[PDB]
């Protein structure tokens, strides 16, 4: 039971770390998706340099 206690605690640490990783990853996913949405229209709208149409 003590051995399994060690196992379950080392398995508790595992899952906490991996849940933190997936959560932070989703945070980055959202911020980067916003980034993409900015860029997509951004490249149709920029400065009006007289020497190009684009």
């Amino acid at each position: 039971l003590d051995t399994q206690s060690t196992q379950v605690e080392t398995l508790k640490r595992n899952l906490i770390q991996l849940e933190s990783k997936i959560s932070e990853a989703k945070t980055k996913k959202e911020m980067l998706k916003a980034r993409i949405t900015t860029a997509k229209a951004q490249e149709q709208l920029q400065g009006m340099v007289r020497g190009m149409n684009t």
Partner: protein, 107 residues
């Protein structure tokens, strides 16, 4: 075929000029403004979405930072009965949530 290329370029050079014929300088400029404004609306919508995502991700960091002290409060309320395991586990969870808070604050 070069024949096909040149015959096609010949047929385009008439539609192009009919289009240039039905061009009106004043009236035409209106679209150059309307569409710019519409895509500007889209761009600022994206800007707002980024702002909102940041202001939402601030939520978890606020929770964890106030919790870095709420956990000390819980540990105190636990040790006030004389139990140290509960306060110790509160410390462990507080360290976990503090690491989460630090990562989220950097983000």
């Amino acid at each position: 075929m070069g024949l096909f290329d040149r015959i096609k370029r010949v047929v385009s050079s008439n539609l192009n000029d009919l289009v240039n014929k039905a061009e009106d300088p004043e009236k035409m400029l209106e679209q150059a403004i309307l569409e710019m404004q519409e895509d500007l609306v889209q761009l600022r919508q994206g800007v707002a979405q980024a702002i909102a995502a940041q202001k939402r991700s601030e939520k978890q960091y606020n929770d964890a930072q106030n919790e870095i002290n709420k956990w000390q409060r819980n540990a105190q309320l636990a040790l006030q009965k004389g139990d140290e395991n509960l306060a110790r586990q509160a410390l462990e969870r507080k360290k976990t949530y503090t690491d989460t808070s630090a990562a989220l604050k950097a983000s």
